[PDB]
Amino acid sequence: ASSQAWQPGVAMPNLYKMQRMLLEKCDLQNYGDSATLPKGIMMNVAKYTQLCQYLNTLTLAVPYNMRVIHFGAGSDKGVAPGTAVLRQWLPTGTLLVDSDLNDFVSDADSTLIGDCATVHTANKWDLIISDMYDPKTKNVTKENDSKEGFFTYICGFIQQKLALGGSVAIKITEHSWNADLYKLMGHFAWWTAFVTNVNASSSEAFLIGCNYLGKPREQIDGYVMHANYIFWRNTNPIQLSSYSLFDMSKFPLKLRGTAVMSLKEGQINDMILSLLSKGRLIIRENNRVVISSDVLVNN
């Protein structure tokens, strides 16, 4: 077994991010292979556990009364395995809201059913998790182009509802991706494409934006960067592994007690951006949390 088999997953190395590759078909050596999971553990429990294991190594801002929203939390089973892992991972008192196009039962404080485009919220969020995937992406009848759908909503939601210092984890695949989303990763202190070891046989990856700055730190071309992601996946086969799942002793996210300040436009100097980049600050209102779901009415 490889050295990274004892890791929760693998992050796209910096040297692959600096290339300018053309988009090629993703052809993984182990495509289709299944990982060996612990007895009775669902795939999405193993997958979210490894994601959270990795998020524990980043400079996440973790304040009291933390606000997390989880899109694409439903499943064909009618339950939310990922929301269950997040509830386990987040500190007690953390507000957790989940949503999906289809009806499902969740351990979240509040669940919204409907297209994510019909979800509205008055307040900002500290962390955004998206596991959304349109099944129609499986019908590849033309060139792999940047997708619209929920990605259009997600890009608008990050720019208007993510607190500065906040972080994101958005799920993508070879064909389920968006160029504007990669461009936004440049608006964070740091970013990467993370692959869980239990699903290394899939082109799936979680784009991770760490510490939102509300302004571009670097200029990123989404078409070029997605090609870079594919080149990395094609040239680096990753060994399937569930080893990280057997040690759950350091799993829970530590409550850093990150400061929450309601600073305005024009009070963001360099020292503030420096504290945002290290997860020592969250900028947003601390008002009551209000969410709603539009209901279209026909005959």
Partner: protein
């Protein structure tokens, strides 16, 4: 005076040889927990499995009103510990057993306040 008694109808379905409700979400944990029945975080011990509350609630899974005047669920947002020997049907286990208000364990599967 009518009301759907789903708890009873399910036992009559289990005695009828029916298939237990599946897709209960088992959690990964150290198995070094308190052993308490319903906790805010997985507390399974070496003889139990931790599950997400909502997935083990009959009322939540069947989309029907809870047996509480307000409609409040005591499993949703929490974790239920189920003995490894009965983990093939967590919903049925939570319906047939009760929790000790003194030590917070399952009566007959952890509780020993009679000693």
């Amino acid at each position: 005076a009518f009301a759907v008694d789903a708890a009873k109808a399910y036992k009559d379905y289990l005695a009828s040889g029916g298939q237990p409700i599946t897709n209960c979400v088992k959690m990964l944990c150290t198995h070094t927990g308190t052993g308490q029945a319903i906790t805010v975080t997985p507390e399974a011990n070496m003889d139990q499995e931790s599950f997400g509350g909502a997935s083990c609630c009959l009322y939540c899974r069947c989309h029907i009103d809870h047996p509480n005047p307000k409609g409040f669920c005591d499993l949703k947002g929490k974790y239920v510990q189920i003995p490894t020997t009965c983990a093939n049907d967590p919903v049925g286990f939570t319906l047939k057993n009760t929790v000790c208000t003194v030590c917070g364990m399952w009566k007959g599967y952890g509780c020993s306040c009679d000693q």
